């Protein structure tokens, strides 16, 4: 299948209560491999996947130096953005940053990305050409001009299209058993009477990896989209994911309804039913 490496960074200012909170996590596909937390004891980038543990001290020292430069960059940004939007010193504000790269199933570069948000709203984001920024407002156009200066634009380019890709592949190789795997959902349905004329039908998918899954209910072939309760895909905690979709069915009509599961693990999409 296709693969991705993503880093996610959150900084939250906390006026009067010391330095801003900074959390960074990296992921290959839906598996976390590293963390940094400004509030933890170590003040180091820390392993979170068994396969990354084999990296030497040059890796750990360098990622720690690098993650701390991201921390410091965000600490300045928080003041900068408060000045750009004329906000007071007293409130808490959030900056979020995500970047990374996708590769196709031949492991060659597909796309690279770098997106930034301020208070949960889009701020600036890099287009697919890795050169042009989409800027939210006037404040972000100032950011755009800084970041599109040719020296700066090139360091980012060389990261996303080169380094990010090379290290993703290295990680894919080193963590083969975890990362180059597909776990097909284990599926079942349940039925519960909410009254003597109505029943909840619930379609379950358990133990699947990667997280991407589509679970939909049909009534005689028509999509029951506005009448389905569909929960957010959620982690089991052991490296696999879970999801369910539920419909409330007038009792006697169970056979009309089919659940449909699509997942890269299934060779053919499944159709489940009360026959």
């Amino acid at each position: 299948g296709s693969h991705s490496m993503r880093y996610f960074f959150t900084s939250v200012s906390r006026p009067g209560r010391g330095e801003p909170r900074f959390i960074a996590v990296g992921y290959v596909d839906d598996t976390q491999f590293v963390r940094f937390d400004s509030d933890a004891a170590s003040q180091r980038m820390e392993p979170r996947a068994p396969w990354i543990e084999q990296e030497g001290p040059e890796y750990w020292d360098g990622e720690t130096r690098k993650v701390k430069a991201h921390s410091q960059t965000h600490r300045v940004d928080l003041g900068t953005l408060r000045g750009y939007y004329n906000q007071s010193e007293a409130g808490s504000h959030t900056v979020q940053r995500m970047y990374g790269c996708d590769v196709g199933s031949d492991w060659r570069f597909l796309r690279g990305y770098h997106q930034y948000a301020y208070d949960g709203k889009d701020y600036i984001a890099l287009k697919e050409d890795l050169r042009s920024w989409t800027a939210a407002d006037m404040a972000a156009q100032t950011t755009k001009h800084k970041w599109e200066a040719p020296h700066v634009a090139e360091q980012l380019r060389a990261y996303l299209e080169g380094t990010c890709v090379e290290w993703l592949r290295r990680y894919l190789e080193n963590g083969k058993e975890t990362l180059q795997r597909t776990d097909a959902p284990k599926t079942h349905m349940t039925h519960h009477a909410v009254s003597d004329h109505e029943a909840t039908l619930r379609c379950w998918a358990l133990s699947f990896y990667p997280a991407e899954i589509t679970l939909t209910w049909q009534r005689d072939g028509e999509d029951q989209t506005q009448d389905t309760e569909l929960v957010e895909t959620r982690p089991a905690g052991d490296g696999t994911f879970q999801k369910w979709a539920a419909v409330v069915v007038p009792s006697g009509q169970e056979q009309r309804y089919t659940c449909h599961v699509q997942h890269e693990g299934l060779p053919k999409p499944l159709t489940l039913r009360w026959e």
Binding site: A24, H70, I124, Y159
Partner: peptide
């Protein structure tokens, strides 16, 4: 591997 050159907004 992290990006080596984050720049201020």
């Amino acid at each position: 591997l992290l990006f080596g050159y984050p720049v201020y907004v």
